[PDB]
Design an enzyme around this catalytic site. Structure first.
Site, PDB file in Angstrom:
ATOM      1  N   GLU A   1      69.103 107.732 -17.202  1.00 49.47           N
ATOM      2  CA  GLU A   1      68.507 107.241 -15.969  1.00 49.47           C
ATOM      3  C   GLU A   1      68.664 108.279 -14.799  1.00 49.47           C
ATOM      4  O   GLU A   1      69.499 109.051 -14.684  1.00 49.47           O
ATOM      5  CB  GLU A   1      69.361 106.016 -15.225  1.00 49.47           C
TER       6      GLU A   1
ATOM      7  N   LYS B   1      71.202 112.312 -12.255  1.00 47.38           N
ATOM      8  CA  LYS B   1      70.905 111.843 -13.614  1.00 47.38           C
ATOM      9  C   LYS B   1      71.661 111.624 -14.540  1.00 47.38           C
ATOM     10  O   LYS B   1      72.686 112.271 -14.605  1.00 47.38           O
ATOM     11  CB  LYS B   1      70.103 113.220 -14.143  1.00 47.38           C
TER      12      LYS B   1
ATOM     13  N   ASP C   1      61.529 122.511 -23.600  1.00 44.44           N
ATOM     14  CA  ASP C   1      61.121 121.202 -23.600  1.00 44.44           C
ATOM     15  C   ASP C   1      60.011 120.806 -22.330  1.00 44.44           C
ATOM     16  O   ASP C   1      60.077 120.050 -21.509  1.00 44.44           O
ATOM     17  CB  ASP C   1      62.025 120.094 -23.833  1.00 44.44           C
TER      18      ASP C   1
HETATM   19  C1  LIG Z   1      61.294 104.522  -7.000  1.00 41.18           C
HETATM   20  C2  LIG Z   1      60.329 105.043  -7.877  1.00 41.18           C
HETATM   21  O1  LIG Z   1      59.441 105.980  -7.124  1.00 41.18           O
HETATM   22  C3  LIG Z   1      58.907 107.327  -7.636  1.00 41.18           C
HETATM   23  C4  LIG Z   1      59.921 108.418  -8.044  1.00 41.18           C
HETATM   24  C5  LIG Z   1      60.169 108.892  -9.349  1.00 41.18           C
HETATM   25  C6  LIG Z   1      61.120 109.879  -9.564  1.00 41.18           C
HETATM   26  C7  LIG Z   1      61.640 110.459  -8.664  1.00 41.18           C
HETATM   27  C8  LIG Z   1      62.687 111.597  -8.929  1.00 41.18           C
HETATM   28  C9  LIG Z   1      63.121 111.979 -10.094  1.00 41.18           C
HETATM   29  C10 LIG Z   1      63.774 113.135  -9.906  1.00 41.18           C
HETATM   30  C11 LIG Z   1      64.570 114.188 -10.930  1.00 41.18           C
HETATM   31  N1  LIG Z   1      64.556 113.903 -12.286  1.00 41.18           N
HETATM   32  C12 LIG Z   1      65.825 114.597 -12.978  1.00 41.18           C
HETATM   33  C13 LIG Z   1      64.976 115.862 -13.744  1.00 41.18           C
HETATM   34  N2  LIG Z   1      64.124 115.167 -14.670  1.00 41.18           N
HETATM   35  C14 LIG Z   1      64.191 115.036 -15.958  1.00 41.18           C
HETATM   36  O2  LIG Z   1      65.215 115.478 -16.411  1.00 41.18           O
HETATM   37  C15 LIG Z   1      63.094 114.388 -16.678  1.00 41.18           C
HETATM   38  C16 LIG Z   1      63.549 113.223 -17.545  1.00 41.18           C
HETATM   39  C17 LIG Z   1      63.053 114.615 -18.319  1.00 41.18           C
HETATM   40  C18 LIG Z   1      62.957 114.710 -13.762  1.00 41.18           C
HETATM   41  C19 LIG Z   1      63.341 113.448 -13.008  1.00 41.18           C
HETATM   42  C20 LIG Z   1      65.161 114.968 -10.170  1.00 41.18           C
HETATM   43  C21 LIG Z   1      65.106 115.478  -8.881  1.00 41.18           C
HETATM   44  N3  LIG Z   1      64.609 114.367  -7.932  1.00 41.18           N
HETATM   45  N4  LIG Z   1      63.955 113.319  -8.635  1.00 41.18           N
HETATM   46  C22 LIG Z   1      63.228 112.674  -8.060  1.00 41.18           C
HETATM   47  N5  LIG Z   1      61.487 110.207  -7.219  1.00 41.18           N
HETATM   48  C23 LIG Z   1      60.663 109.244  -6.984  1.00 41.18           C
HETATM   49  C24 LIG Z   1      58.180 107.039  -8.795  1.00 41.18           C
HETATM   50  C25 LIG Z   1      56.806 106.251  -8.537  1.00 41.18           C
HETATM   51  N6  LIG Z   1      56.449 106.062  -7.134  1.00 41.18           N
HETATM   52  C26 LIG Z   1      55.327 105.489  -7.114  1.00 41.18           C
HETATM   53  C27 LIG Z   1      55.368 104.272  -7.241  1.00 41.18           C
HETATM   54  C28 LIG Z   1      54.453 105.743  -5.655  1.00 41.18           C
HETATM   55  C29 LIG Z   1      56.754 107.269  -6.339  1.00 41.18           C
HETATM   56  C30 LIG Z   1      58.080 107.913  -6.566  1.00 41.18           C
END
Ligand SMILES: CCOC1(c2ccc(-c3cc4c(N5CCN(C(=O)C6CC6)CC5)ccnn4c3)nc2)CCN(C(C)C)CC1
Length: 293
Positions: free
Chosen positions: A19, A33, A131
């Protein structure tokens, strides 16, 4: 100690990896994360990389800390980007020329930075990501991107010719796997092979983004690569059949040839997709090319 001072506020992502949470630390948003049991080794590799290699770069996700917190969890704490990933962002908006080139140049800059070994005490080994995909590239509010999720990364030092591959059960996302991974002909003992794997995946992300750049009032829906020829959650053998046997590649919309930028990106991405890995462009060449467009 960073983890003990974090207030978790909202889950913003969930997957097999675990998550992602939006947290607050010293009054600032942070990304936490929380790794799943299935993916603890990615946490370990990323932690080792961020604690031993000087990586900091505009287009690499900013690292704050790694911790095992106490119920025991593995946490990787980074800067927070409220736009979320490129996958998320490309589905709620279309792009123009400026915003499209800013995204793709910033990815190429981060990838070139990973790939290139820098000599000396301010340097770094060469690094291949293995990846890259739209779901682990974040979009900043200023419109540049940064690459995340280095749990599969491999390192290389040209001076000693040492190749450090990790022993991680995880493999790359099957939809983005290069031909040589799918037919098991990749030269596992050569660092250049992992860079070429990155370039393949970059070409696919390029296609994903370009589709969303408007030209002459026309845009394509967001789609993941190969959406039209494999099922959701494609198998390894599904992908091998399409990419290696049938030699399929993502289709270029004709409307792109009326826009000079999209015509140039189309040429670039096809040069990432050669079956022959050594024929692909390098990250730096892509960067240079995109600096000129
Ligand atoms: C409440 C929802 O909100 C929205 C949203 C979605 C994500 C984030 C977010 C993810 C990350 C991040 N991660 C860690 C590094 N990663 C990975 O390892 C990937 C898994 C392989 C990427 C993810 C790191 C740093 N920052 N981060 C911000 N933030 C906001 C989802 C959709 N909404 C819509 C409804 C408008 C908008 C934003």
């Amino acid at each position: 100690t960073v983890a003990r001072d974090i207030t978790l506020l909202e889950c913003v992502g969930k997957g097999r990896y675990g998550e992602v949470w939006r947290g607050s630390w010293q009054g600032e948003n942070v990304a936490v994360k929380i790794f799943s049991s299935r993916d603890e080794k990615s946490w370990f590799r990323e932690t080792e990389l961020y604690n031993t290699v000087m990586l900091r770069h505009e287009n690499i996700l900013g690292f704050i800390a790694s911790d095992m917190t106490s119920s025991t969890q593995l946490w990787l704490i980074t800067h927070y980007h409220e736009m979320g990933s490129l996958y998320d962002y490309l589905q709620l908006t279309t792009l123009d020329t400026v915003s499209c080139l800013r995204i793709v140049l910033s990815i190429a800059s981060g990838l070139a930075h990973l790939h290139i070994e820098i000599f000396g005490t301010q340097g770094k080994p060469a690094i291949a990501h293995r990846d890259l995909k739209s779901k682990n590239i974040l979009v900043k509010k200023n419109g540049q991107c940064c690459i995340a999720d280095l749990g599969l990364a491999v390192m290389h030092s040209q001076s000693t010719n040492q190749l450090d591959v990790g022993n991680n059960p995880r493999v790359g996302t099957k939809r983005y796997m290069a031909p040589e991974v799918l037919d098991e002909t990749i030269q596992v003992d050569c660092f250049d092979s992992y860079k070429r794997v990155d370039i393949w995946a970059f070409g696919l992300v390029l296609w994903e983004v370009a589709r969303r750049m408007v030209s002459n009032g026309i845009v394509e829906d967001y789609k993941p690569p190969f959406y039209d020829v494999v099922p959701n959650d494609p198998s390894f053998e599904d992908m091998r059949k399409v990419v290696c046997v049938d030699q399929q590649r993502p289709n270029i919309p004709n409307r792109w040839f009326s826009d000079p930028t999209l015509t140039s990106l189309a040429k670039l991405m096809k040069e990432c997709w050669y079956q022959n890995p050594s024929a692909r462009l390098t990250a730096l060449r892509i960067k240079k090319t995109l600096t000129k467009i």
